[PDB]
Amino acid sequence: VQFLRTDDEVVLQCSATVLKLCLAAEGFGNRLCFLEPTDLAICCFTLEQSLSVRALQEMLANTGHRTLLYGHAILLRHAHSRMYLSCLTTSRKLAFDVGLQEDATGEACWWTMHPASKQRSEGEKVRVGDDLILVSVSSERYLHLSTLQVDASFMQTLWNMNPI
């Protein structure tokens, strides 16, 4: 059993139905995320920061290797493009597009981590392989696999953060 910490390079995976899907994006003209079945250049995200919502709110108002905790908000940096995973405003239904944002400002590039069940709880450490929920701070929608795309909708999808 391993714990996740900021500065860790990870890939975000979920299951469609049956092989797994990795959240991905190019970042050099195209900012929309897509799915990659299982490379790294498009799948690797760095866990830049992990803050409590309060800290997050304070940092915004006034504009190391820390272990992730459920309830905390994380900032995901696309290692290749150097941009940030964010909840976009566009859409092409009741779900928003997900993708890269050049600057790491605003609430769109922050996501809070939540337990899939009671086996984890707000405040506990997030383990590698844990099934978790990702909620967009700016939209309050979940990182979701729409059925084959990735979006932020009212419907949840479980994800895993696995180190490369």
- Sign of the Cα pseudo-torsion (75, 78, 82, 85, in order): negative
Q: Which of 134, 159, 141, 137 lies closest to 97, judged by CA?
A: 141
CATH number, domain with residue 67:
2.80.10.50
Closest listed residue to residue 162, CA positions, set 50, 65, 20, 66: 20
100 vs 36: CA distance, rounded Å:
16
- Total domains in the chain come to 1
Q: Which amino acid is at 42?
A: I
Resolution limit, Å: 2.5
Is residue 69 within 8 Å of residue 123, measured between CB atoms? yes
Domain that holds residue 135: 1-164
CA 145 to chain centre: 13
CA 93, 96, 100: angle at the middle one, nearest 5? 145
How far does the chain reach from its first CA to its final CA, in angstroms?
Answer: 15
Give the HSE-up count for residue 50: Cα atoms under 13 Å, Cβ half-sphere: 20
Only one residue has tokens 């009212």, namely 154
Which segments of the chain does DSSP mark as H helices, in order?
A: 40-43, 53-61
**CA neighbor of 65 nearest in space, from 6, 9, 126, 124:** 6
Length of the chain: 164
Task: Give 27-70 as a DSSP string.
Answer: -SS--B-EEEE--HHHH-EEEEEEE-HHHHHHHHHT---PBPBT
Residue 40 to residue 122: CA distance in whole angstroms: 31
Of 160, 24, 152, nearest in space to 87 by CA: 152
The CA distances from residue 61 to 54, 98, 106, 129, in Å, are: 11, 24, 10, 34
